[PDB]
C-alpha cells in the first residue's frame with residue numbers, strides 16, 4: 205500500500221508531531237473552516253466564535269482521540285479496513301455521518317501539518333500523507349450498509 | 350468482493366446480453382450525452398449529431414471491444430486489479446484520460462442495461478452492477494502515476 | 495444552457511410520465527438507497543425497508559418538486575429557492591449525493607419508458623437533472 | 634457565499650503574499666501533480682519534472698488570475714468569463730481537479746505564512762478558492 209520510502213517520510217514526520225496540540229487544531233479548524241459540521245458536536249459547550257472554539261476544553265480532548273486513532277492507523281497501514289472497522293460502524297450506525305465528510309478532516313489535518321512544519325512539509329512528504337488520509341477515509345467508509 | 354447471490358444476478362443477466370448491440374449503444378451514448386469525450390475519438394470520423402454517432406461503424410466496433418473487457422472482468426471478479434492493469438497503463442500513458450471519466454461510461458452502461466431489460470432490472474440487480482461498474486473504474490485507475 | 499431542444503425534449507418526456515411521477519420518484523429513491531447506501535445517512539429517521547410508505551410519500555414530494563422545475567425551466571434559481579435553502583443550508587447534503595439520485599432517476603425513466611429514452615432525450619434529461627442539482631446545492 | 638468579513642480577510646492576506654504570488658502559484662501546482670497524479674493527464678505536452686521552468690511559467694499565470702479575482706470578488710463571473718470558457722468549453726477539466734488545486738494552494742499558503750494563516754483566514758481562503766472554482770467550472 206505504501207513504499208518503503210513513503211513509510212519513511214510518514215513516520216519520520218509523525219515522530220516529530222506533538223499529538224496534543226495537533227489534534228485540538230485539526231479538529232478546531234474542521235469546525236471553523238466548515239462550520240456546518242458543528243451540528244455533530246452540539247454537546248461540546250460553546251462553539252459560537254472561532255475564538256471560543258480553538259480554546260474549548262472538550263474540542264481539544266476529542267482532538268487527541270481522533271489523532272491517536274490516526275496514530276494507530278500508522279502501526280497498521282497494510283490493513284486499515286482492519287484498524288478502523290469498529291470506527292466505521294460507529295460513524296455510520298451511531299452518528300449517521302456521510303463518509304464524504306472524511307475528506308474534510310483529512311484535509312484540515314494536512315493543512316495543520318503544513319502550518320507546523322513549513323519547508324519540511326515538501327511536495328513529496330505531502331504526497332505521502334494524502335495516500336494515508338485517502339486510505340483512512342476509505343477504511344472509515346467500508347462498513348457502511 | 351461480491352457475495353454469491355450478487356454474482357448470481359450479475360452472471361444471470363450478463364448471459365442474456367447481446368455483446369454486439371449493447372456495446373455500440375453504451376459508447377454511442379457516452380459520446381452523445383457527454384460530448385466533451387469526443388476529443389478522445391476524433392479518428393473515428395463523423396461524430397457530429399446523435400444519428401451520426403449511433404450509426405458510426407467504428408464507434409460500434411470499439412463498443413464491442415470495451416464490453417469484452419467487461420466480460421473478462423466479470424470472469425475475474427475477485428482480482429479486477431490484475432485484469433485491467435494494462436488497460437490502466439494504456440488509458441494513462443498513451444491516452445491521458447482523467448479517470449473521473451470512467452464513472453461516466455459505467456453509468457451509461459448501466460442505463461443501457463435498464464433501457465434493454467426494463468422491468469427485469471431490479472433495484473437489486475442494479476445494486477450489484479453498480480458494484481461491478483465502480484470496481485472496474487477503480488482498477489483502470491490504479492496504475493496512474 | 496439548456497437549449498430549446500433540451501427544454502422540449504424534457505417537457506415531452508415529462509408529459510408522457512404523467513401520473514406515474516410519484517411512483518417513479520418512489521422507485522428512484524429506493525434504487526438510490528440501495529445502490530448507494532451512504533445516501534441513507536440523510537434519512538436516519540425513515541422506515542427505509544422495501545415498500546415503506548414513508549419512502550412512497552417522499553417519492554411524491556420529490557416528483558412534484560421536479561414537475562415544478564419542468565414548468566419553470568427558465569428560472570430554476572427562482573422556482574427552487576425554498577428547496578435550495580433546505581438542501582444547501584439546513585440539511586447540508588453533499589453535492590456527491592445528487593449525482594447518485596439523478597443517475598437513479600435516469601435508470602428509472604429508462605426502465606419504464608424505453609421508447610422515449612432515445613440518446614438525445616437521455617442527453618437532455620441528464621442536463622436537466624444537473625441544472626436542478628446545481629440550483630439545489632449552490633449556497 | 635463570501636461575507637464582507639470574508640473579503641477583508643482575503644485582501645489583507647493577498648497583500649502579504651505580494652511579490653511571492655507567482656512563486657506560490659508554481660509550488661502549489663508541483664504539489665497538485667504530485668499528490669493527485671491524475672491532474673497530470675491535462676498536461677501531457679508539459680515538462681512536469683520537479684522545478685520544470687514551464688510549470689513556473691504556468692504557475693505565474695495562475696497567480697495573476699488569482700490576483701485578478703481578488704480584485705473582482707464582487708463580480709467574479711464577469712471578470713473570469715474568458716477563463717471559464719477555456720476550462721469548461723475548450724479543455725473541459727473535471728470539477729474534482731479544482732478541489733485538488735485549491736487544496737494544495739491552501740497547503741501552499743500555510744507552509745509559507747503560518748502567522749497569517751489563522752483559522753478565520755483559513756476559512757476565508759477556502760470559500761475564496763472554492764468560489765473561484767465554481768466560476769471556472771460552470
Ligand code: HEM
Pocket residue numbers: 241244245269270273274291294295299301305306308309310340341344
Ligand atoms: C479522519 C476521519 C475521522 C476519524 C479518524 C474520526 C475518529 C473518531 C474517533 C476515534 C472517535 C472516538 C469514538 C469513541 O469515543 O468511542 C470518534 C467519534 C465521533 N466522531 Fe469522528 N472521526 C473522523 C471524521 C468525523 C467527521 C467529519 C465527523 C463529523 C461530521 C465525525 C463525528 C464524530 C462524533 C460526533 C463522535 C462522538 C463525539 C461524542 O459525542 O463523544 N467524525 N471519531
Ligand code: HEM
Pocket residue numbers: 386389390392414415418419436440444446450451453454455485486489
Ligand atoms: C469504463 C471502462 C473502460 C474500458 C474497460 C475501456 C477499455 C478500452 C480498451 C480494451 C481499449 C483497447 C483498444 C485496443 O483494441 O487496443 C481502449 C481504447 C481506448 N479507450 Fe477506453 N475504456 C474505458 C473507458 C474509457 C473512457 C471514459 C475513455 C475516454 C473518454 C476511453 C478512451 C479510449 C480511447 C480514446 C481508446 C483508443 C481508441 C483508438 O484511438 O483506437 N476509454 N479502451
Ligand code: HEM
Pocket residue numbers: 533534536537552555556559560577580581585587591592595626627630
Ligand atoms: C433532484 C433532487 C432532489 C429533489 C427534487 C428533492 C426534493 C425534496 C422535497 C420536495 C422535499 C420535501 C420538503 C418537504 O417535505 O417540505 C425534500 C426534503 C428532503 N430532502 Fe430532498 N430532494 C432532492 C435530493 C435530495 C438528496 C440527494 C438528499 C440526500 C440524499 C435529500 C435529502 C432530503 C431530506 C433528508 C429531506 C427532508 C427530511 C425529512 O423528510 O424529514 N434530498 N427534498
Ligand code: HEM
Pocket residue numbers: 672673675676694695698699716719720724726730731734765766769
Ligand atoms: C483557481 C484555479 C485555476 C485557475 C485560476 C486557472 C487559471 C488558468 C490560467 C490563467 C491559464 C492560462 C491560459 C493562458 O495562458 O492563456 C490556465 C490554463 C490551463 N489550465 Fe488552468 N486554472 C485553474 C485550475 C485548473 C485545473 C484544476 C486544471 C486541471 C488539472 C487546469 C488545467 C489547465 C490547462 C490544461 C490549461 C492550458 C495549458 C496550456 O495548454 O498552455 N486548470 N488556467
